[PDB]
């Protein structure tokens, strides 16, 4: 039970050392029902043009790397047919098969946090101001330090939002431990307080990628180690045609 | 009520309830009777008051501000929120969705700072896009279709109920979204925050001397619903239109890690 | 019940409800306590 | 009309009452209740969650990531000493107070039933180890050797493939509730851990690694007088 | 007596209360029913009526009858420009604020529902013509040709002898309800009017016409949170 | 129903009736929908 | 609503009611009830249980144990004397206030029933006699002489094996209740003690032995009329 | 019984138990009283 496949609209995923996927909160994501719906119009539904693996930028795992997030839907813009119909739709759903994926050797070692947090409102460096939408949206990096101006608080142990870093377990989340599994797959399905929400302007999760135990190795392993994110919507559809947004 | 503890014996067996892997998302189900020998005990523990409707069923305080009898500083407006004061945000800001509806309890009292005849005190609530007074003979005072609680002092304090008034299907303490299309304007769960201000004076006309009220509202959430638990908040709260803060340490310190008193 | 509006009603405490599955393990192949975990 | 007769409690406010009031707003239409994924019912359900647990929160790491990690090595020297110990209330310890479990117990004055520290194993895949974690009921003082620590409810764990192991406190107490503060009636053990043989690690590989703890609930564990967190600590008008 | 406890809420005034009350006139003989025709038992009746919109109400137009109807002509220029464009939603925008539908909208707080615009071409009956009348709900800026426009929920309206066409606004809204009230969060899109060919005039009829509008709600359309209207704004004793 | 009177009771909120078509359409003629108005 | 109406009384604290009063922590769980051994359900239960009555409580004699012991000796003079004489009244008299039959009558202010009085002598075994204990109700004075109290309902007491003997004071009095505090209209008789033959004691064994009192209720007893004990008398802040 | 909590009650002041058999003869072996105690 280890080897698993994950096929979405003409592109599969392979892994062989890998935890079971979670499904975020017990639900499996699905189409919005007549009787949950708010707007009168057929919705559309692309299902495997936009309903399949996308491949973010990879990124580099060091020793003193603090940490990563990014900002889904929005992080999905401008890839794909998925991003086409953000531009051309008002509103949007989706259910998110994330398979973040980190391979090693059995002389590495280090631990991941792969968690998904809906509705990560950020902190600002100066407590008093307002950051800009750039701040938020190659993925953002935390910092082992306190910085300071017009960003997002992006220190570690207050992991942006002003929690316990430690205490994100709480969020549907895996953990990959290179000694065990060399990827964690996430299901999310589509959590929000409104059945329909503009995919632009509203960050319906965040997913935050934070090595508790640094990565280690000696000599001669290979130093760089990349953190691929594969995230692909499900159950995606569409509501309220017009206008292509210039964004 | 809780799960009672089942006896279990020396075992010796190729199964392993203590063996688990974190690391599949999954916390284990194992229970004391599957690591030691235990015995039978009958837990009558119920778990009656940690449920939501138990926890977030006290009401708490929300708004204080002053308002004087005989300009601006004659009455006092709130415009609603949770964030004004921490102990009743922190439990609020716990779950991402949660969807209530709240009784309000205002606690009015006055002070001087020559005799004060009787107080009668109005709390008129506009809903969002009503008309605001400016002054205390308004004329926004009469309330045709705005809700309103006239109460006099020495009687038992203004309990009314509210309903759940929010557009969505629930209430969001948390928003990670912009105001505008553009991702530009108000960041936060303030866009969200549309309820509407809250108006409270003396009927009174004026009086010999000052007069200082002071106002307490004490929100009680109840028919509580709530989604998407987040961890509680560690760090303080400096604003109250964002969720902004300075880094804080994660836990009190030791001085080893086998250092304990 | 002496109001006919839902909202101004007296507090539901006495139900207690839970479903800790959810939070505890959300994950979709079932994993046994018994079993080893893969 | 009917003759009543007004009883003491009359015309006052008790925060934690269940009374009906009038409603502000009649025949309101609510917005129409849909289905939002993952919601909790108690409290409870959420104190039964991992949390990772700052056991190494010595003077100068708490603001940092090596709060949570715990040095665990490969030598000759001070393998007949602890590699952790800590206080077992959740409440008032300063290494598990800020966790879930911690967190959700604040809000409360007493408590009941089993917690469990779970250990993830950080390591490489090639370094192998046992350690003994040990829970040993108050009454002495801490074991301070590995013999000592050995008489309590103790896990010896082999690192291998499942690289986790569970602790299962098993609620030892003389009463039915625990007090979260720290009071001597109802104090908890203490939770040590020693290195059953040690980490042995090949030529290659990295000698240095760190366990990963964790602490939640049982199905057991319950809450039961609510009162206000002391963490918040309001200054003054935000 | 019976034993009474006076719980929070006792002697206030709360304006919004169903309580009943001692009759000042007791045994009073009310005047026989009779029927009167046109009786309302809701105000979504008289808010689905139609109401003339002041389109064209443009500095120097509104205090007079050119508010309400909206310049079409016959020409070689500026056939690449909208006709009108206007808010969508009917609390706070400047055209149909006043009408029917908004006028029973102000006293509310959120609204749900579809409305709907009605175009009565007030031409001759020799004067032809097409036209596309879109809406495109927000997250884009206001369509600045035609191309932009007909990429929303529009309708091409030939002109002959029915001489009036609906453009159902069709509640395509993230939530259940919208703010009456201008805010970013639930705003409505924009109703933009476009040349589809042109208006076409024989040699002697007149060649300057215009369109009259019309909005009213669906069937489908409700109202949710009392409030008072912005618009009397009494200054003092009458 | 605690008084004798009638004009001192509770106001009749519960109750929701409606006839719009004494209003949008109290044309002599039935007009269909489908069919063209004239 | 329902038309009401505010009896005397009202709005009044009497400290002994029986309302019911709101919750000050909902839906509390309490801890399970554990049997625990002696559950006393009545304080009459209590009271009638023996304890030593301090009958020799003259001045000198009361902070110390001689106050328990009643001296009985062997000899020609003072055979025709009491041995002891106190009220029978256990609220006011200076001997049996302060027995457990005492304490618990004076948080009271009437009393009915039976009392019995447990004479246990401490001698040796060798040492024998015969004791005339008499109780004459009130009306007359204080026997003076064993004539004079075999009239009243006396005992006889052999002293042997047994070496323990009752007298029940046989409860007559005019009225259903006697008054705790010392009034004529309600005093009980009094209780005194002769020598029937004398103490015998062979040569070795010592000459002087002492008989031990008790007093405790009968099945029939009751007090009737709460109010505070007169004992504590607080002088101030503690 | 007007709430749900049952410490917000009136107090059962109307029963009337009692077991004097555990204070007064506690002994193991009954003593009759008729018979002599040893
Ligand atoms: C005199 C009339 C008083 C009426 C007062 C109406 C109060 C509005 C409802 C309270 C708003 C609750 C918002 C909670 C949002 C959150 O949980 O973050
Ligand atoms: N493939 C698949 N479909 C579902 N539909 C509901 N649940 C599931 C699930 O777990 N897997």
């Not at chain 1, 559309?44 to 839907?73: H, I, M, N």
């Not at chain 2, 008051?49 to 069923?57: A, P, Q």
């Not at chain 4, 250990?119 to 009921?137: D, H, Q, R, V």
Request: proline letters at 7%; charged letters at 15%; a negative charge.
């Amino acid at each position: 039970d280890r080897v698993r496949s994950m096929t979405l609209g003409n592109s599969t995923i392979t892994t062989q050392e890998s935890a079971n996927v979670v499904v975020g909160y017990g639900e499996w994501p699905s189409y919005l029902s007549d009787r949950e719906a708010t707007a009168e119009d057929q919705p559309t539904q692309p299902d495997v043009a936009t309903c399949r693996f996308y491949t973010l930028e990879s990124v580099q795992w060091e020793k003193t790397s603090p940490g990563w997030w990014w900002k889904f839907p929005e992080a999905l813009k401008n890839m794909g047919l998925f991003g086409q119909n953000m531009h051309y739709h008002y509103l949007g759903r989706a259910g998110y098969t994330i398979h973040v994926q980190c391979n090693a050797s059995k002389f590495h070692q280090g631990c991941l946090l792969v968690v998904c947090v809906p509705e990560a409102e950020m902190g600002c460096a100066d407590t008093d101001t307002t950051f800009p939408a750039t701040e938020l949206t190659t993925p953002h990096v935390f910092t082992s330090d306190s910085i300071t101006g017009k960003k997002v608080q992006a220190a570690v142990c207050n992991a942006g939002m002003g929690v316990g870093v430690g205490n994100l377990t709480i969020f549907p989340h895996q953990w990959i431990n290179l000694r065990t599994n060399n990827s964690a797959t996430i299901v999310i399905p589509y959590i929000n307080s409104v059945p329909m929400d503009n995919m632009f302007r509203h960050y319906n999760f965040t997913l935050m990628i934070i090595p508790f135990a640094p990565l280690n190795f000696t000599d001669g392993a290979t130093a760089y180690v990349p953190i691929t994110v594969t995230i692909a919507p499900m159950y995606a559809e569409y509501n309220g045609l017009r206008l292509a947004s210039t964004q | 009520t809780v799960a009672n503890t089942q006896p279990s014996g020396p075992s010796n067996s190729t199964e392993i309830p203590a063996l688990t892997a974190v690391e599949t998302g999954h916390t284990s189900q194992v229970d004391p009777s599957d690591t030691i020998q235990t015995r039978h005990v009958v837990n009558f523990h119920s778990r009656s008051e940690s449920t939501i409707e138990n926890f977030m069923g006290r009401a708490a305080c929300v708004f204080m501000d002053q308002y004087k009898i005989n300009s601006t500083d004659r009455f006092a407006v709130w415009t609603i929120n949770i964030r004004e004061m921490a102990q009743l945000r922190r439990k609020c800001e716990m779950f991402t969705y949660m969807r209530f509806d709240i009784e309000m309890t205002m606690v009015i009292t006055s002070c001087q700072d020559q005799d004060m005849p009787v107080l009668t005190h109005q709390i008129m609530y506009v809903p969002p896009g009503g008309p605001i007074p400016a002054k205390v003979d308004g004329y926004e005072w009469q309330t045709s279709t705005n809700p309103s609680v006239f109460w006099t002092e020495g009687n038992a304090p203004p309990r009314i109920s509210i309903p759940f008034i929010s557009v969505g299907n629930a209430y969001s303490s948390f928003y990670d979204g912009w105001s505008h299309f553009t991702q530009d304007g108000t960041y936060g769960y303030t866009t969200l925050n549309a309820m509407g201000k809250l108006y409270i004076r003396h009927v009174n006309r004026s009086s010999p001397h000052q007069i200082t009220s002071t106002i307490r509202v004490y929100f009680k959430p109840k028919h509580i619903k709530a989604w998407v638990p987040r961890p509680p908040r560690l760090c303080p709260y400096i604003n109250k239109r964002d969720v902004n803060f300075v880094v804080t340490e994660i836990t009190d310190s030791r001085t080893s890690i086998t250092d304990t008193p | 019940n002496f109001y006919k509006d839902a909202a101004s009603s007296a507090s539901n405490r006495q139900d207690i409800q839970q479903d800790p599955g959810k939070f505890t393990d959300p994950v979709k192949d079932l994993m046994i306590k018994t079993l080893p975990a893969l | 009309g009917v003759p009543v007769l007004n009883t003491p409690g009359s015309n006052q406010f008790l925060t934690s009452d269940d009374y009906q009031s009038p409603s502000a707003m009649p025949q309101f239409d609510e917005t129409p209740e849909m289905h939002i994924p993952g919601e909790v019912r108690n409290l409870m359900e959420i104190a039964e969650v991992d949390s990772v647990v700052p056991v190494n929160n010595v003077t100068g790491k708490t603001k940092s990531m090596d709060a949570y990690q715990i040095p665990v090595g490969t030598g000759n020297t001070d393998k007949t000493k602890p590699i952790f110990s800590f206080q077992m209330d959740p409440g008032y310890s300063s290494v598990l107070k800020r966790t879930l479990l911690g967190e959700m117990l604040n809000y409360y004055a007493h408590w009941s039933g089993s917690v469990k520290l779970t250990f993830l194993f950080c390591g490489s895949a090639m370094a192998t180890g046992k350690l003994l974690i040990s829970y040993s009921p108050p009454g002495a003082s801490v074991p301070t050797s590995r013999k000592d620590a050995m008489l309590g409810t103790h896990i010896v764990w082999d690192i291998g493939l499942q690289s986790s192991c569970v602790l299962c406190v098993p609620w030892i107490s003389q009463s039915h509730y625990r007090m979260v503060q720290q009071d001597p009636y109802t104090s908890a053990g203490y939770i040590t851990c020693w290195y059953q043989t040690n980490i042995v690690v090949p030529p290659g590989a990295p000698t240095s690694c760190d366990v990963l703890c964790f602490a939640s609930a049982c199905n057991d564990f319950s809450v039961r007088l609510l009162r206000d967190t002391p963490f918040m600590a309001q200054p003054g008008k935000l």
